[PDB]
Amino acid sequence: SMTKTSVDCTMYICGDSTECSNLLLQYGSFCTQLNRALTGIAVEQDKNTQEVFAQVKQIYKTPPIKDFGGFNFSQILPDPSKPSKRSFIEDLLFNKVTDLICAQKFNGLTVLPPLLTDEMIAQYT
């Protein structure tokens, strides 16, 4: 999935001015459909994670007494002592992937939060 974004042409044409609002009424729904198009994108971003990350509705756990038959799975398994559940591999996957966003929000660019957080995704995994 990608970053959910929402844009409003009400504040994009200009803010706190009746001159923009009056002329947008003459243009009608031109950017009203654009607001619905970007809204539908944010809906598709959350549905991409549902059909992939969660295969089943049941949650499974590891045993307290672990006999793996000689393999070491402690690398892929999350750490139960951490407040956020993460494995040794997921620690690098999160840290190696990189205000710019806050400055863009001042022009009317709204970044919607995801449906599932980092704690959620690791629990389905």
**Least Å from the CB of residue 11 to another protein:** 7
Q: What are the strands, taking DSSP E only, across 11-117?
A: 109-111
Nearest by Cα to 48 from 38, 36, 40: 40
Closer of 63 and 120 to another protein (Cβ)? 120
From CA 17, how far away is CA 10, in angstroms rounded? Answer: 10
Number of residues that make up the chain: 125
Site for another protein in 38-67 (CB under 8 A): 38-39, 41, 44-46, 48, 51-53, 55
Q: By CB under 8 A, is residue 14 in contact with another protein?
A: yes
Four-residue CA torsion sign, 51, 55, 61, 63? negative
Q: By CB under 8 A, is residue 7 in contact with another protein?
A: yes
Site for another protein in 56-115 (CB under 8 A): 76, 86-87, 89-90, 93-94, 97, 100, 103-104, 106-108, 110, 112-115
How far is CA 72 from each of CA 61, 77, 107, 124, rounded to the nearest angstrom? Answer: 16, 10, 51, 21
61 is written with which tokens?
């756990």
23 is written with which tokens?
């002329």
Q: By CB under 8 A, is residue 31 in contact with another protein?
A: yes
Question: What is the amino acid identity at position 95?
Answer: N
Residues within the interface to another protein (CB under 8 A) = 1-3, 5-17, 19-20, 23-24, 27, 30-31, 33-34, 37-39, 41, 44-46, 48, 51-53, 55, 76, 86-87, 89-90, 93-94, 97, 100, 103-104, 106-108, 110, 112-122, 125
